[PDB]
């Protein structure tokens, strides 16, 4: 179980490409965007867009491929009709079923067309082991009696994966609040050690533009399966501790405690994750990490810590593997202002322990989704790295299986 706990120089990480084990990831002459990779217990869920446009939402098993290396094996694929309307899927597993919450819009991405968005959501329940001649079991679109959002005007899932606590599901989500109704005292903006900042920066940066109609607040969507035959979804806003713009977040189980991660799309370049103190209301004990950040743009580049007016960043999450020392793993982009050079990194709060470069220093790489698990009492991690192929001129996901070494030699 125990891993290498100290900073070392030897290339102990030996990532293995398992992309062709998942045959849908790899196709010739096709652009594949908006990926989702979610795992829990023994199964997983996956989604992408073949932009003959097609949306694919599938589930399967994480099994030993043979040489004691895990790989994803698909057990059920769903092709939802009208792929132009389906946006921002989020996946949670519970009791031999996978629940995929997803938004429906006829005005494009609701993030970019916030005012015109219909607000309609849809929830589909996929079976991990589908029955032949199985209606209402293989895949079945559930009915939501109501969507409780409070003072927020609209809510929407905004993240790859979530957790289940007993009989209740918790999707990562975000709340659309009218900016006029947003209550904020600009004195809370940490412009103390930032002489080029202003009090109104992080308040105006709660929307994609300073003059934005809405503001984005990350949080959770709650689905209690034991709440009548037709349960409802309730929104749970994240606390004001280290508040940032509503970004694609992720909540996952790790060693018997849920962990929360929020993407850095604002000025808070440093990674925003940590153990969850309370699920309802949401309170995340953020790490005080000072070594992992994400590539942004010109005004909010990597490692920026000063409140600025910006909406720049990329989604690179981490997975806690040793809570005692708080050692996490994730594929991050070694770049300041471009989405380039993905590196699998194992790090503590103030020290990068060991790393391994997945590609070349100038390889286009955007989204990264990392989940870790055990395989015969050994700690493995499967990461999904959006990578641009040099030849096909089309971005594409890639699946890497990295084992966390036990020794440091």
């Amino acid at each position: 179980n125990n891993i290498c706990l100290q900073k070392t120089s030897n290339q102990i990480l030996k990532p293995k490409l398992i992309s062709y084990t998942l045959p849908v990831v790899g196709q010739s002459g096709t652009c594949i965007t908006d990926p989702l990779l979610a795992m829990d217990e023994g199964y997983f869920a996956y989604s992408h867009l073949e932009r003959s446009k097609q949306r694919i939402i599938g589930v399967g098993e994480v099994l030993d491929r043979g040489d004691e290396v895990p790989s994803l094996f698909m057990t059920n694929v769903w092709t939802p009709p009208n792929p132009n309307t389906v946006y921002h899927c989020s996946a949670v597993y519970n009791n031999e079923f996978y629940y995929v919450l997803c938004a429906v819009s006829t005005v494009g991405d609701p993030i970019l067309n916030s005012t015109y968005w219909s607000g309609s959501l849809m929830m589909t329940r996929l079976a991990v082991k589908p029955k032949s001649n199985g209606g209402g079991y293989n895949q079945h679109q559930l009915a939501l009696r109501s969507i409780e959002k409070g003072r927020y005007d609209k809510v929407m899932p905004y993240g790859p994966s979530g957790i289940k606590q007993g009989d209740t599901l918790y999707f990562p989500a975000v709340g659309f609040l009218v900016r006029t109704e947003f209550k904020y005292n600009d004195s809370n903006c940490p412009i103390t050690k930032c002489q080029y900042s202003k009090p109104e920066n992080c308040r105006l940066s709660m929307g994609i533009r300073p003059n934005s109609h809405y503001i984005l607040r990350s949080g959770l969507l709650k689905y209690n399966l034991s709440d009548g035959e037709n349960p409802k979804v309730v929104f749970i806003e994240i606390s004001d501790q280290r508040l940032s713009i509503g970004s694609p977040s992720k909540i996952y189980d790790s060693l018997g405690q849920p962990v929360f991660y929020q993407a850095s799309f604002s000025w808070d370049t440093m990674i925003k994750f940590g153990d969850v103190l309370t699920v309802n209301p949401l309170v995340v004990n953020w790490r005080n990490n000072t070594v992992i950040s994400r590539p942004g743009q010109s005004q909010c580049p990597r490692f920026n810590t000063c409140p600025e007016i910006c909406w720049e960043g990329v989604y690179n999450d981490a997975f806690l593997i040793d809570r005692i020392n708080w050692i996490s793993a994730g594929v991050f982009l070694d770049s300041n202002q471009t989405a380039e050079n993905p590196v699998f990194t194992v790090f503590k709060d103030n020290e990068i322990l060991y790393r391994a470069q997945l590609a070349s220093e100038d390889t286009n790489a955007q989204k990264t989704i990392t989940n870790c698990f055990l395989l015969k009492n050994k700690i493995w991690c499967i990461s999904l790295v959006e990578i641009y192929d040099t030849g096909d001129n089309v971005i594409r996901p890639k699946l890497f299986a990295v084992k966390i070494p036990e020794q440091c030699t």
């Epitope: 080029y196 590539p295 010109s298 005004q299 007016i309 990329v314 220093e361 100038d362 390889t363």
Partner: antibody, heavy 127, light 109 residues
Framework: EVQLLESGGGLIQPGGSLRLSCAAS????????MSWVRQPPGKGPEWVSG????????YYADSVKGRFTISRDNSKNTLYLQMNSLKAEDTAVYYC????????????????????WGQGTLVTVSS | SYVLTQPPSVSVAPGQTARISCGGN??????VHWYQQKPGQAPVVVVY???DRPSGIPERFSGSNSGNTATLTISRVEAGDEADYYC???????????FGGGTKLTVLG
């Protein structure tokens, strides 16, 4: 329209000082990233420095690192460039360039491109 | 650090197409921009983000990027197109923007 008006160029000993000013009109000056691109007579352009919209982040080139210092006054809608320890190589026309990108994106395949350019200011480092 | 290589000069006949090569190590993974500079004038941008054209730029100006070379193709070359062209990029290996040597396009006839 948008226009950049450089000034402050001239004639200076090697190792001397010189500060150029760039007056900007036609856009919200605080919202954009400004840069200094210099071009020797009869040669290609070269990027000297750059500064974020709020002035929090300053980016220099290795050729002028430690000798040039970029600054910005968003209230006066003006961009500066303090040149110290000038070498005879620095003799060039100095343009003032504004980042031309406008929109709400998360990542830019080209985070740096210029629109428009100024009209340059002549700087001659000679004895 | 990063290196952009441009051929020194290009000659094309009027009405035909003129293709300006911009070479760079794995330049496909990089956003290439194009600047036209007529004599005594400041450089004007004619193509940005590989293929996007600025407002007011003639539609016959088109940029393409694939592999180790991005080519700015000037379709239906006119007499006024006689200018110096520079491709530009951002090198995230040193946080510099890099230009090319330039290409003086002379129109024949």
């Amino acid at each position: 329209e948008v226009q950049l008006l450089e000034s402050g160029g001239g004639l200076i000993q090697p190792g001397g000082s010189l500060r150029l000013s760039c007056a900007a009109s036609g856009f919200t000056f605080s919202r954009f990233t400004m840069s200094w691109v210099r071009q020797p007579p009869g040669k290609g352009p070269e990027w000297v420095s750059g500064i974020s919209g709020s002035g929090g982040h300053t980016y220099y080139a290795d050729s002028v690192k430690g000798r040039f210092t970029i600054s910005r006054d968003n209230s006066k809608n003006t961009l500066y460039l303090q040149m110290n320890s000038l070498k005879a190589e620095d003799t060039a026309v100095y343009y003032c360039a504004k980042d031309g990108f406008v929109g709400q994106q998360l990542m830019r395949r080209g985070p740096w491109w210029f629109d428009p350019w100024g009209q340059g200011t002549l700087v001659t480092v000679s004895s | 650090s990063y290196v952009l290589t441009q051929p020194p000069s290009v000659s094309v006949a009027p009405g035909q197409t003129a293709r300006i090569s911009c070479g760079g190590n794995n330049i496909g993974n990089k956003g290439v921009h194009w600047y036209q500079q007529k004599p005594g004038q400041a450089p004007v941008v004619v193509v940005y983000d590989d293929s996007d054209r600025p407002s007011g730029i003639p539609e016959r100006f088109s940029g393409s990027n694939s592999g180790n070379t991005a080519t700015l193709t000037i379709s239906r070359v006119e007499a006024g197109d006689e200018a110096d062209y520079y491709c530009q990029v951002w090198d995230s290996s040193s946080d510099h923007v890099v230009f090319g040597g330039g290409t003086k396009l002379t129109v024949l006839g």
